[PDB]
Amino acid sequence: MKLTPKEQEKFLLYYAGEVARKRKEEGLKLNQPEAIAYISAHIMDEARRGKKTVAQLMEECVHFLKKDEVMPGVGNMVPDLGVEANFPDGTKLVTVNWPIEPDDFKAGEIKFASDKDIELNAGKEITELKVTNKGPKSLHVGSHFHFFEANRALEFDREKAYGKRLDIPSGNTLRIGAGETKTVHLIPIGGSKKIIGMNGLLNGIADDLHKQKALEKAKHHGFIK
Amino acid sequence: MKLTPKEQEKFLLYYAGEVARKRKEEGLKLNQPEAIAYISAHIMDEARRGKKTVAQLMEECVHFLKKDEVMPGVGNMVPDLGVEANFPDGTKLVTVNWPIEPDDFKAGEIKFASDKDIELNAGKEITELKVTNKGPKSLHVGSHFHFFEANRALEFDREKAYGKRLDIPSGNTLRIGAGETKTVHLIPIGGSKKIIGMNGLLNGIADDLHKQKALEKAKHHGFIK
Amino acid sequence: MKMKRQEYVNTYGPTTGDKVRLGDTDLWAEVEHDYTVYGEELKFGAGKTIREGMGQSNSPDENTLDLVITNALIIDYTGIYKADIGIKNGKIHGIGKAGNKDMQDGVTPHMVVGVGTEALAGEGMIITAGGIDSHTHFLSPQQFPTALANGVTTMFGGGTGPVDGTNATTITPGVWNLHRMLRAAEEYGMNVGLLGKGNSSSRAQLVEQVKAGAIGFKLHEDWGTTPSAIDHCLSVADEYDVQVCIHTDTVNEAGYVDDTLRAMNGRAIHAYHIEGAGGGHSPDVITMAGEVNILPSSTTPTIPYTINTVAEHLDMLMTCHHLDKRIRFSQSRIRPGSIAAEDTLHDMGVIAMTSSDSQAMGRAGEVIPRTWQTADKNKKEFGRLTEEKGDNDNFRIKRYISKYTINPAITHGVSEYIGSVEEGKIADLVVWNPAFFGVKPKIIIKGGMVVFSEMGDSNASVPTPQPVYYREMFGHHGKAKFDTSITFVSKVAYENGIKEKLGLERKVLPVKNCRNVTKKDFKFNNTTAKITVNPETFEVFVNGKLCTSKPATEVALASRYTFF
Amino acid sequence: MKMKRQEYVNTYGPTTGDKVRLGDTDLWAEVEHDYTVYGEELKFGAGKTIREGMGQSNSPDENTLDLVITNALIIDYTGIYKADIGIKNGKIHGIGKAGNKDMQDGVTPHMVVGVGTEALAGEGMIITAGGIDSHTHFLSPQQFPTALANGVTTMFGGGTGPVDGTNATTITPGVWNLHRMLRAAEEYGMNVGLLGKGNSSSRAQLVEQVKAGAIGFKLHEDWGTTPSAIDHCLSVADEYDVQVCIHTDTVNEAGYVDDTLRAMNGRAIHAYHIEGAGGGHSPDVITMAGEVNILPSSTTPTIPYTINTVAEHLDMLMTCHHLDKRIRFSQSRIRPGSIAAEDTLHDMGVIAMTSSDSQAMGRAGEVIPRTWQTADKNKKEFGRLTEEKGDNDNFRIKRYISKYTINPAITHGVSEYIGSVEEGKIADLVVWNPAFFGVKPKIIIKGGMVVFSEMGDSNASVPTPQPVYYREMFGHHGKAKFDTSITFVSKVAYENGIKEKLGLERKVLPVKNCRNVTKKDFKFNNTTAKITVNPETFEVFVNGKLCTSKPATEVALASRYTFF
Numbered sequence A, B: 001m002k003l004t005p006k007e008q009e010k011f012l013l014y015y016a017g018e019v020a021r022k023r024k025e026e027g028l029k030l031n032q033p034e035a036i037a038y039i040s041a042h043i044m045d046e047a048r049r050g051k052k053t054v055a056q057l058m059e060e061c062v063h064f065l066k067k068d069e070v071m072p073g074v075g076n077m078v079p080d081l082g083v084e085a086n087f088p089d090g091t092k093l094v095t096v097n098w099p100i101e102p103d104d105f106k107a108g109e110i111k112f113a114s115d116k117d118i119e120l121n122a123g124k125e126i127t128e129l130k131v132t133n134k135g136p137k138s139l140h141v142g143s144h145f146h147f148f149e150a151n152r153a154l155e156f157d158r159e160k161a162y163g164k165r166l167d168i169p170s171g172n173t174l175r176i177g178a179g180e181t182k183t184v185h186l187i188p189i190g191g192s193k194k195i196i197g198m199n200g201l202l203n204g205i206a207d208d209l210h211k212q213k214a215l216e217k218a219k220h221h222g223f224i225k
Numbered sequence C, D: 001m002k003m004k005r006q007e008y009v010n011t012y013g014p015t016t017g018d019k020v021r022l023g024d025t026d027l028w029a030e031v032e033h034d035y036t037v038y039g040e041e042l043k044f045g046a047g048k049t050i051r052e053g054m055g056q057s058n059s060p061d062e063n064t065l066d067l068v069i070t071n072a073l074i075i076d077y078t079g080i081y082k083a084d085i086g087i088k089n090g091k092i093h094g095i096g097k098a099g100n101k102d103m104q105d106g107v108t109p110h111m112v113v114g115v116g117t118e119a120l121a122g123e124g125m126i127i128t129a130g131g132i133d134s135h136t137h138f139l140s141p142q143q144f145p146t147a148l149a150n151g152v153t154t155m156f157g158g159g160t161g162p163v164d165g166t167n168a169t170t171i172t173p174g175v176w177n178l179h180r181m182l183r184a185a186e187e188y189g190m191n192v193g194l195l196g197k198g199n200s201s202s203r204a205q206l207v208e209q210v211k212a213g214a215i216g217f218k219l220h221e222d223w224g225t226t227p228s229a230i231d232h233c234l235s236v237a238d239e240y241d242v243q244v245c246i247h248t249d250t251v252n253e254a255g256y257v258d259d260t261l262r263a264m265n266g267r268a269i270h271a272y273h274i275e276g277a278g279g280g281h282s283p284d285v286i287t288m289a290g291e292v293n294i295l296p297s298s299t300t301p302t303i304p305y306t307i308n309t310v311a312e313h314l315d316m317l318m319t320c321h322h323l324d325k326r327i328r329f330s331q332s333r334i335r336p337g338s339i340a341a342e343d344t345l346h347d348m349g350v351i352a353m354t355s356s357d358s359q360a361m362g363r364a365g366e367v368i369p370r371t372w373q374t375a376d377k378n379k380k381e382f383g384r385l386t387e388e389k390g391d392n393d394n395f396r397i398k399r400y401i402s403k404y405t406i407n408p409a410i411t412h413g414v415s416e417y418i419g420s421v422e423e424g425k426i427a428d429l430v431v432w433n434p435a436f437f438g439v440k441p442k443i444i445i446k447g448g449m450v451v452f453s454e455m456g457d458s459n460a461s462v463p464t465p466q467p468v469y470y471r472e473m474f475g476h477h478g479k480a481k482f483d484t485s486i487t488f489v490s491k492v493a494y495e496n497g498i499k500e501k502l503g504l505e506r507k508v509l510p511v512k513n514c515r516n517v518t519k520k521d522f523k524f525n526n527t528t529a530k531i532t533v534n535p536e537t538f539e540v541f542v543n544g545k546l547c548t549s550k551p552a553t554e555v556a557l558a559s560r561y562t563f564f
């Protein structure tokens, strides 16, 4: 047989699916592991039959188990499911979003203090700036990237972006499509404003003293046209 | 699924139960591991249905497999069975006494040389003593405990119990219920009679020389009233 | 900029004032404080915060963290708050706001995220200390994966393996057996500490064991828990700063409960299965829990009190102790009264710890679920604690978490190293998804490394595909396990080079400050009272008021999560 | 029981809400919190608290303090509060409530008063951290007793002795001179750190010095503070994590102030005598103080600004620099503007540190008095700070204490060891009587031992009889001075066994985290602004508003306390 360690895993998953099937046939509402194994075994079966595409299965398995076919809170506990199976074209990953239909019960439920919005970067002075991606390809810029050092494809008043970053949620990026024009909101960088790296236009404190040197380096390197 | 190593064990036990069920359906007499797995899977099934109590299952599973449903000697080989299963109130231990009905065949049978009783503590002089548990709670006293040092709740002529132990089988205990009166049979302690520990009334050889000191300590500590 | 509350919570997890449901229980944890600066939160990923010269510093710093647990919701006796956790040199380096002071406001000075920092996203996760199971019977090495899979990182107790002595008692008796077990311990990821035989009325035999590496002694009735034994054992423990654990004289052979308490003479002692079903003076052992010097714990089978608890025991006692089938009952009248009271005593902070009694009248991977099932049961029966401030169960949560984290650590003399989420302590932490809190952990960190975690298909294109099951990680393997695991010993053994002498490669640390830990020393479970048992009805009384609870028909963190 | 407020304060010192006048100044310190339990306060003496089995424990504990400072009023950037201070192993073990948990309520767990604990009554006393003087010219070993007698425990700077180079600059130049001085340091009670010659346009010569043990470099105009020198020096400092101190080009030979600032290139640098009378670009060196990368200090002669400050300088400059009597003035028009502004800049938190310039245009035993004289002067002129909350000067006090304690420690990379009254730090503390605060200390503790104190007649029946004068204590003598004193070195030197190689018996510790300390890193003195000087009027401007102060006709902590 030459059973690989991954094949040995799949036997257990498949057997768990078979036990879950038996319990559903008995009329029992399936729990979290039973529900996952029941859907996993279906995917593994269809893959072996090699008549359905990954695309077909991803669609077919949404709400494969209905809210009344599982215990309360099971649907919300499993927002997505992933199962690798061998298809005629090889092993492919079947990714299902909402495999089990949710209900009103939620384990690990978060109840907010207030529905009021969170004021991020509070008290920082906003700078409105028009930017144009004159490049042939779209690009994104992160929340903490030194805006002044962004891809030379971006056309904007760089002097006004010196020592500033995007006033967007931490970890988010702003997209500027090829040819697209946008109004960005910039705020001054926190801490000491010791900008080291990126495009190396600054590599030091973003003070007035470093500004002329930084603008000259930006012009020389093609960021300022 | 987040399968714990204990859940992985239970899948094997459950599958073994399913194979045993198939073999019984074929009309085959189940062997020792098949019989255990067949009963185990039933318990695991009933627990998941969550309609029966542990008490109900313990009773239901006595002679769950009949002598003719198993190979000879199987019942005798499995005098008791234990299986932990998840009930709606959590994991509980289902303990079954005589799960498989025995037959007159016995593997590993002990055949006695004689049916005549074994004379324990042979040649030791028996001392009959009246004891009363004047305490509010019942108590037991072991075969090798120095009787003289027993719970002060026990009322008896302690002088007569000095350097003696109960003439009962090794490992057995004698119960004296709250308020109960009994006639105990005491025999002198074996070996050197070097009594160290328990209530520390003696802590040395139980000779005539140590007796007065021991009786005074017993009186002082409240054993002798 | 103004961020929608739902979007903030999805991205960074809950903030100040938000309430989190613990698993499927009715317990609500409220975020007491958030240590972040809104807009400066660390996020890992493509185009995110933790990047060269941005959230990640380019400036070398002596406090560059080895690991950062971003946006964690800490649940500990110290508080229920939101913070970034910084690990360095296998210890909790800092708790607060991590990042780069060069580009960010409000960064905790000793929480530098740099080139050498690994990232772990804790946003939307609950971070707790690793559990300490102080009632382990070292019966089977297979208990260790089961324990880790249930958030337990440290195990105190004793054994030799599947032998009658161990099967019954947490005892590794004598020098040779202690040395053998301490050398066997090298194999595992679990932190260990061994107890020797305390059942002796002779000094020498007890001293030999402490010097052999024992972290204490277990006095167990199977070896005779007589008043002479109790006194001799405590005397040696006092001399050597080690803990004593006790299973009292069930049959009241040498005396009643008060006679045992008298023998102890106000000395520090850890009372196992205080309720008494697991063993001890019948029917009044529970009365010991009221005493200041008594450090009491509970074993898993009696917590919570369910409709099957009594039935299960009236047979489970016969398999463990190997009793005649002629014995039917006494336990049927005694047991309901004390099992019920025990749950309320936990809620009152009278019983300070929860333990397992693993494969010896108790379950290895059940300490954590059963503690939270009891917390939930009481909340459901008695309602929200009067002690609570606001629409939350923070006080109850803190009372219950202390039972398996800090309080066992205080009892065993390891509170300076482990037991809680505090700066300076060893990084033995557990990451939980709130929907699975108390039932199924995500990641187990020991000594700053991941040692055990839930993991999917080994071949798979991502770590999520099925079957997802618990597996050993890098920190549990090779010579890295010697860097992440601790073998606790007595000070005498430690100071006399037990590590070198036994050729132990694991971290060897001494247990210290065991002798002067009273009820007053615990966290959220310092309650002392006059506990009495009616010898006719078997009802339990706390200062004259009947102490009881109703049996549960169903429990939380059970049926929804398990296959079998 | 009800105790009269006056009687409580006499017995235990001030409690929450009480205000203490600092010396004869108009500065009022308010007790923010008291860590005691009323009725459980520790008192030492016959029939008092600290006695066997009472306030002093009979129970052995791993946290038994070596020393207890009972009922201390801590004045530190961390807060102005009332607490017991516990010392163990020459470090601040704990801050809170000390005593015996066996007999007392509310005892801080790691603050055990036991058989091995010494007692020091701090009731009614102010306890502060030992001062750090970061501008020492190692000219005379006689500066050390003068420094200690004024609450200074650490001294950074340089020298060889009474030679022209040292007389002018804080520089111990080259390997041989550095080794000689580090070996000379063994003699003293004072913590030391030496700076080498930073005035080099060649790498090798700078590297040799760091490897020889230097904690940094001093760039001084006497050896030419050219832009080439500034760049080369900072480059090596950045590589080796050491601090750079600067005395700028007074005569603007190679460039103006902006040319110097440009050469620095936003790199961390300690700017000595920022006002400019002590030296630096005339008339605009003060303009550097507005910059984020510039860590500025003041020297004692210009603080506070008095009616004799200008007159004293127009001659003190001629004795130090050895100038012709043909030179009359320029300093008469330039100096009033910057000397006046300097005092206000201190009050605004623009100038972060105060230093001495000892026997080289500044006084050794004047750092502490002069800081408080300036604090008092400003309070008297500008009134209570707007930043203050309540009828107190707590914020101003915290701003000023940081100038000679924490801020010099942060600058020089020793903040992890010394600088403040915090758990884990070395026990370098000063005990003050409130009537003599800032002018005359009572006891100087270094590494948990008393090293220097005010002491009366050596023959006398008690320690109080006259003449009471400052004397060296046991911690300053024998081999105990090696246990209480630190010689700070670079990491390179430390890691390469400088201690062993030079046969230094003193505690040798490395300076770390110097390169990334900006203005933002300081405590209560993080102010950045656009500082400008009118080149015609010499007036100083902070963001366009005239920055000035009036000269004092009399100062606090002076005439009432000194004979001469």
Ligand SMILES: [Fe+3]
Binding pocket: C168, C247, C272, C273, C278, C279
């Ligand atoms: Fe037990």
Ligand SMILES: [Fe+3]
Binding pocket: C135, C137, C168, C169, C170, C272, C357, C360
């Ligand atoms: Fe046990």
Ligand SMILES: [Fe+3]
Binding pocket: D168, D247, D272, D273, D278, D279
């Ligand atoms: Fe100078």
Ligand SMILES: [Fe+3]
Binding pocket: D135, D137, D168, D169, D170, D272, D357, D360
């Ligand atoms: Fe100088």
